[PDB]
UniProtKB/Swiss-Prot annotation:
Coiled coil: none annotated. Residues 1-129 form the Helicase ATP-binding domain. Transmembrane segments: none annotated. It comes from Saccharomyces cerevisiae (strain ATCC 204508 / S288c) (Baker's yeast). A motif (DEAH box) lies at residues 80-83. Catalytic component of ISW1-type complexes, which act by remodeling the chromatin by catalyzing an ATP-dependent alteration in the structure of nucleosomal DNA. They are involved in coordinating transcriptional repression, activation and elongation phases. The ISW1A complex represses gene expression at initiation through specific positioning of a promoter proximal dinucleosome. The ISW1B complex acts within coding regions to control the amount of RNA polymerase II released into productive elongation and to coordinate elongation with termination and pre-mRNA processing. It comes from the Eukaryota. Component of the ISW1A complex, which at least consists of ISW1 and IOC3. Component of the ISW1B complex, which at least consists of ISW1, IOC2 and IOC4. Present with 1500 molecules/cell in log phase SD medium. It is found in: Nucleus. Belongs to the SNF2/RAD54 helicase family. ISWI subfamily. This is ISWI chromatin-remodeling complex ATPase ISW1.
Amino acid sequence: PGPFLVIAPKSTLNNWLREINRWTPDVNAFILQGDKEERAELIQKKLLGCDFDVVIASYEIIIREKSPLKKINWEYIIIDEAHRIKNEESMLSQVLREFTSRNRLLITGTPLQNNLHELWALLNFLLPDIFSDAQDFDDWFSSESTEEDQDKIVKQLHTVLQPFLLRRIKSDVETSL
DNA sequence: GGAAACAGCTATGACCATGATTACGCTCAGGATGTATATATCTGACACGTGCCTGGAGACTAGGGAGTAATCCCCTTGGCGGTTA
């Protein structure tokens, strides 16, 4: 049981704290909310005191709290609704390539929205030392064969990501019928 | 019957109210003053003719400024979300 970092949109920080209490009450988590002073007593007392397991913050708070969070090495950076990361220049991306966690569990509700460029934008922060490349990934696959429309080289895209990534749909396993 | 005590009357002073007087201002007076006005007469400067000539106005060629098309890509724009001073 160690240091954990999870991120939720402002509207959703209640739910994750609510569900963690309902299901596994043994984990120390905070909703890191409040004012500049009201975030401080969280910083020095509990966050600096290493008196927690997970920390629930918002999109901007981590940017507001980048410096007091670097000094704590993490286990995962749990990223719900990972849509702000679609842009590499979205400032949240440059604040997350700076933290040092052993694993980096990105989470989403919907997959990539528009482009292959976007796909490895999610993918490049997953295993950065492996790719370390931006346009190399792109012209390697050449955008679903945008010129020849072979639509068979897409199988190579699928074959790497199938044992590297997991999709399930509601229609298959209803759970709601 | 005498003495004290109080009450009412009287007078006088004080204070307020009214009348007059005066002084000052101003607004009429009236004088002083300076300004407009008109006129008749100089006069110098502005306007106009004359002559002349050289810039202005065509007349002509030639070569690149300006003008357009096509292209693109970067940027401004706007609404929001969430903070905070």
